[PDB]
């Protein structure tokens, strides 16, 4: 389950928007206007069982610009349901 760099196309932008949507609901970072996900976007595969390839889900690490501030968002994504959870939302963070 190593981290892999993915693109910052619409799918990744939609992940950043999910993160900002979730940050907004949590109310710990004020009101944020999603702008964009910038590189690098990283994805890790979570396996159901060590030694087996069945995928349990993914974790993403995103650098998201919201309200002109840079945040680092970590998002989990269940493989079967594609249900996402904002695990961590930190910042403003250093440019990557």
From Swiss-Prot:
Identify the keywords attached in UniProt to this record, alphabetized: Taste-modifying protein
Question: Which InterPro entries has this protein been placed in?
Answer: Cystatin_sf, Monellin, Monellin_B, Sweet-Taste_Mod_sf
Any Pfam family matching the protein: Monellin
Q: Mind telling me which residues the site (Blocking, abolishes the sweet taste) is annotated on?
A: 41
Give the recorded use of this protein.
Natural monellin has not been mass marketed to the food industry, primarily due to the challenge of large-scale purification of the protein which is relatively sensitive to heat or acid treatment.
Q: What does this protein do?
A: Taste-modifying protein; intensely sweet-tasting protein.
Subunit field text = Heterodimer of an A chain and a B chain.
Which protein, by its recorded name, is this?
Answer: Monellin chain B
Specify the species: Dioscoreophyllum cumminsii
Q: What is the lineage of its organism?
A: Eukaryota, Viridiplantae, Streptophyta, Embryophyta, Tracheophyta
């Amino acid at each position: 389950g190593e981290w892999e760099e993915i693109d910052i196309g619409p799918f990744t932008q939609n992940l950043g928007k999910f993160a900002v949507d979730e940050a907004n609901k949590r109310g710990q970072y004020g009101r944020l206007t999603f702008n964009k996900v910038i590189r690098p976007c990283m994805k890790k595969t979570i396996y159901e069982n060590e030694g087996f390839r069945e995928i349990k889900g993914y974790e993403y690490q995103l650098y998201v610009i919201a309200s002109d501030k840079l945040f680092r968002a970590d998002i989990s994504e269940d493989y079967k349901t594609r249900r996402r959870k904002l695990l961590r939302f930190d910042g403003p963070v250093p440019p990557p």
